[PDB]
Amino acid sequence: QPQVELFVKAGSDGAKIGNDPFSQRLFMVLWLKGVTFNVTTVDTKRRTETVQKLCPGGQLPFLLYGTEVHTDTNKIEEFLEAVLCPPRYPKLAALNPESNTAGLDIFAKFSAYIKNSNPALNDNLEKGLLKALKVLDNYLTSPLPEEVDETSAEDEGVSQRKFLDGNELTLADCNLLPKLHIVQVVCKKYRGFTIPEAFRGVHRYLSNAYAREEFASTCPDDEEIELAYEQVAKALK
């Protein structure tokens, strides 16, 4: 196996995991592949000579695979899915195309909601975020083609699958989960907003994700995420 090294964003102390859902997505992909890999955090104000030479463009995250450097998170993920393949490593792509688009609009709705300071607009932006979360909830609770089995009498027609595409984490989850993590942490801290309990699909999904080391161990600390948003999350005024 060629050497695999992921270079990721460091946090406020220049060493710990920083806020960056792109770095986290790729850490999750590599973990799910079962490949041996290293992960090196990068303080962009205090780069090492090594990092400056590997990637003088300075993009983060970046991947060293053998002696080849890759940038652009989406391209890095496509490369890893192709080159780390069966039989030694599992294919992580979703089977159902809609798994790859469900929930993708949430992060932009969240960003607008937290950056806004116009009080009159706040309830509109909160509703936009709730509606995008509800569309994700409806996807998670809709049975996929691989599910044709009876459901409990109490939850007929409700999918109980663990993750976006089925019972295994896929590339789709590696993209979405780090973004939902930010959404939940930042909205709690700066908007007093919580995902309604009635969004039972979304809450089952997050609970199942947090119980998995691939997601839990690659999350930045809540404090780091809160600090990252401290000067952009605006109070209504």
UniProtKB/Swiss-Prot annotation:
It catalyses: L-dehydroascorbate + 2 glutathione = glutathione disulfide + L-ascorbate; chloride(in) = chloride(out); iodide(out) = iodide(in); thiocyanate(in) = thiocyanate(out). Glutathione binds at D20, L60, T73. InterPro entries: CLIC, CLIC-1_C, CLIC_N, Glutathione-S-Trfase_C-like, Glutathione-S-Trfase_C_sf, Glutathione_S-Trfase, Thioredoxin-like_sf. Its EC number is 1.8.-.-, 1.8.5.1. The oxidoreductase activity is inhibited by rapamycin, amphotericin B and IAA-94. The channel conductance is regulated by pH and redox membrane potential. Inhibited by IAA-94. The modification S-glutathionyl cysteine is found at D20. The chain crosses the membrane at residues 22-42. Disulfide bonds join D20-C55. GO terms for biological process: chloride transport; platelet aggregation; positive regulation of osteoblast differentiation; regulation of mitochondrial membrane potential; signal transduction. Residues 89-229 form the GST C-terminal domain. The modification N6-acetyllysine is found at K9, K115, K127. Belongs to the chloride channel CLIC family. The protein seems to have very low affinity for glutathione, even though glutathione binding was observed in protein crystals. PANTHER family: CHLORIDE INTRACELLULAR CHANNEL PROTEIN (PTHR45476:SF2), CHLORIDE INTRACELLULAR CHANNEL PROTEIN 6-RELATED (PTHR45476). This is Chloride intracellular channel protein 1. It comes from Homo sapiens (Human).
